[PDB]
Structure 1
Amino acid sequence: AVGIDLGTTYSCVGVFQHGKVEIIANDQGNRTTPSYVAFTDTERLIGDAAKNQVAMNPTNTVFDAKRLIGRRFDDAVVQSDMKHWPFMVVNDAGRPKVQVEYKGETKSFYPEEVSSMVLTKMKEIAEAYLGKTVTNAVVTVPAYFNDSQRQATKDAGTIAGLNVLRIINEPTAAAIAYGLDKKVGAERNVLIFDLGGGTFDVSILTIEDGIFEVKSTAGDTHLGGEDFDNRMVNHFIAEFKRKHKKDISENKRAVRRLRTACERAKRTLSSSTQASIEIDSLYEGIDFYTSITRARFEELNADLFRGTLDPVEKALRDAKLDKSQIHDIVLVGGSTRIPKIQKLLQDFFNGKELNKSINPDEAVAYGAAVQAAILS
């Protein structure tokens, strides 16, 4: 049996074998797989192959399905999100469905149907690894999901040919990965700080003799690493203007290139104090050979970074807890690799050491897989 982190932009699958969890790489060798389904006139792609031809086929490549699951077409947030997604969303008796062109025809899919397709792939990734069919699974969802959202996610599993042993919360999955429930004795308060996959979630749990309870959730559904890339992009757009009196912002090809280079630079700045950027002939034949210090990156994001403590404070208050009552702090999500994020959080917890040794993209599936093994 397997645990699957069904994520908003990427998903991850783990399997507990020989007394240990293995996180499973897909065909391209990647331990996470884009939650993307693309439709063409000939076929249907899922995962990396879908994300790879997105610029090619943008209005027929579906993603972010998790933001629709259990929602009403009416929801302000849905109507708002629709203006940004290139694919369509139509109303089916109050319910949202994504709408695309598939093999020449117009087809529409419930958010859960798109998720069942991502799940099938995560299933197949594991099966491919085990050489044996996979029938049982634990699948995770955000703590704030309601019973409707949970059920839809379960149905997605069911359609994908999975018996969903249980739907558990992502923060809970993460705490499990770190063995926090096995820290025996008095109840423990755990703060899960999950910054990744285009969302930011802070969760507070209490564990008592291995029983989990969610005390409070807070965060920002539209804050993630892309915000940080954007500040870097705009910074460099400005730099080009101060250096060549030209504004590249309208040339989509140039922005795409600078954006992509900025994404790379950001990751490099997580482990180095400076990054170099080189884009040959960026705009009107003008090369762009420059660089950026971690310090300057932090400055450009100073407000965004600081602001992640606001949901931390809201979550504490709503749990009726002072920072000092938190026994365990857990870092999950790709963006928690940013040093300035880690520092801001530790400092806010007066120096307390963070649980972070587990790959932040994998901790959730890791916890899911542990649980799946227990439940089977």
Structure 2
Amino acid sequence: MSKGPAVGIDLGTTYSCVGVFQHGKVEIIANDQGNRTTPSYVAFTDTERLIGDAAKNQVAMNPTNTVFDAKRLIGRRFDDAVVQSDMKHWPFMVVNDAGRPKVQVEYKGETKSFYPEEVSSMVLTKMKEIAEAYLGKTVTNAVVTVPAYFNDSQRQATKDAGTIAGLNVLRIINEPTAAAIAYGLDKKVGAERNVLIFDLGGGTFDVSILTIEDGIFEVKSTAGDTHLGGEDFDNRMVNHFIAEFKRKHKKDISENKRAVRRLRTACERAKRTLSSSTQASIEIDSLYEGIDFYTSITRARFEELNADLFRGTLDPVEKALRDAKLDKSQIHDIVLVGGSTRIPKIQKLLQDFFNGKELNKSINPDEAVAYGAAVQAAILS
């Protein structure tokens, strides 16, 4: 294989993405399964190690030895509050090893431990491989993203993952900054620009305010909810449906894991449909005790079920403006990142708060940070 170009890699909490700059355009590379995003999942089975779709697709069969959310652990101490709180919810074991966290799994019959940056290297390895399969050339040089709030430890532990994966990390860039690069915010004529990056997706919510002068990006404030995401919207749809089944049939399907899953999978398709349609239909044959479940959901009802969560996304924006010492009128640009910003209501709420200011959403909100990261990789080539 010939020497290839530099790639941009968005290393995320729940999903990762890789992009390349070729023929004056950014191409988001699809994986072996044909997907433009790969889950940040690594499974250790009795026979092998699976990464991405293959690891996620078998999580139900091997919950304990399937690792995900390494980004929540990377660069942090074991006694860190986030680590203590988060581990109370994972199916996998997190152990203390001289003050540092390690994840304990069963790989090929043996009990093994991996550091968060070792698990992240395995995901970065899969991104490099996804890019090589597409280009038919060897990839080494890459730009990897990190959230603007990552400290010195968290930034280096990520650089370390790139190194363990065999990548030449050209630069480490803030995700919010890479979102501004994608929309060419830096190349805009005039004075300093105040930019707000609205990130809702990949199981986290991140508001970022940056000011760019002379091609310089400065984080003026970060805010958000570390546990808010699409899945929270889903639960509200599932509860609405569970209670609807109780009303129409007087049976509780909540205690049946398979009924709830069939329903959950159907709610994720419905929520997605409700981003482009005013109604979504669900037809599940023999959902519970032989009863068929044919129902429909309005965009209005979906919005009402998540009204508190949706409005609540604006408190973080307010918190960040107060910290950056800026008025809403001083924000030059609004950038939407993450899939959950595809929701019409979130868009409406944000545009109204900014008194009708048009939002930057042209680039796929899941591919936005990886697009910029690939633009930056071309510049450093």
Superimposed CA distance per residue, residues 325-375 of structure 1 (whole angstroms, 9 cap, x where no aligned partner)? 000000010000000010000000000000000000001000001111111
Which of 252, 258, 280 lines up with 1:247 in the alignment? 252
Shift of 1:206: 0.3
Shift of 1:22: 1.1
Shift of 1:211: 0.8
Matched, 1:206 2:211: yes
Shift of 1:45: 0.3
Superimposed CA distance per residue, residues 51-83 of structure 1 (whole angstroms, 9 cap, x where no aligned partner)? 111111111111001000111111222122112
Indicate the SS of the match to 2:356: coil
The number of equivalent residue pairs is 376
In structure 1, stretches of 5+ residues that fail to align are none
Instruction: Find the aligned partners of 1:75 and 1:290 in 2 and give their Cα distance.
Output: 45
Superimposed CA distance per residue, residues 110-153 of structure 1 (whole angstroms, 9 cap, x where no aligned partner)? 00000000000000111111111111110001000011100000
Indicate the SS of the match to 1:58: coil
Instruction: Find the aligned partners of 1:72 and 1:255 in 2 and give their Cα distance.
Output: 36
Indicate the SS of the match to 2:166: coil
Superimposed CA distance per residue, residues 160-179 of structure 1 (whole angstroms, 9 cap, x where no aligned partner)? 00010111000000010000
1:241-320 to 2 correspondences below 5 Å: 241-320=246-325
Q: TM-score, normalised by structure 2?
A: 0.98
Q: Which residue of 2 aligns with 1:14?
A: 19
In structure 2, stretches of 5+ residues that fail to align are 1-5
Indicate the SS of the match to 2:137: coil
Q: TM-score, normalised by structure 1?
A: 0.99
Superimposed CA distance per residue, residues 18-58 of structure 1 (whole angstroms, 9 cap, x where no aligned partner)? 22211101111111111100010000000000111111111
Shift of 1:272: 0.3
Instruction: Find the aligned partners of 2:217 and 2:299 in 1 and give their Cα distance.
Output: 38
Give the RMSD, CA atoms, in angstroms: 0.7
1:1-376 to 2 correspondences below 5 Å: 1-376=6-381
Shift of 1:84: 1.1
Superimposed CA distance per residue, residues 246-300 of structure 1 (whole angstroms, 9 cap, x where no aligned partner)? 1111111111111111111100101000001111111111111101100000000
Shift of 1:185: 1.7
Instruction: Find the aligned partners of 2:99 and 2:288 in 1 and give their Cα distance.
Output: 46
Identity of aligned residues (%): 100
Shift of 1:7: 0.5
Superimposed CA distance per residue, residues 227-251 of structure 1 (whole angstroms, 9 cap, x where no aligned partner)? 0000000111111111111111111
Q: Which residue of 1 aligns with 2:3?
A: none
Instruction: Find the aligned partners of 2:147 and 2:216 in 1 and give their Cα distance.
Output: 18
Instruction: Find the aligned partners of 2:152 and 2:36 in 1 and give their Cα distance.
Output: 29
Q: Which moved more, 1:171-180 or 1:17-26?
A: 17-26
8 Å CA contact 1:187–1:208 kept in 2: the answer is yes
Indicate the SS of the match to 2:362: coil
8 Å CA contact 1:71–1:78 kept in 2: the answer is yes
Instruction: Find the aligned partners of 1:89 and 1:184 in 2 and give their Cα distance.
Output: 49
Instruction: Find the aligned partners of 2:283 and 2:303 in 1 and give their Cα distance.
Output: 21
Runs of at least 4 residues off by over 4 Å:
none
Instruction: Find the aligned partners of 2:246 and 2:218 in 1 and give their Cα distance.
Output: 53
8 Å CA contact 1:184–1:209 kept in 2: the answer is no
Instruction: Find the aligned partners of 1:214 and 1:373 in 2 and give their Cα distance.
Output: 24
Instruction: Find the aligned partners of 2:147 and 2:316 in 1 and give their Cα distance.
Output: 15
8 Å CA contact 1:119–1:157 kept in 2: the answer is yes
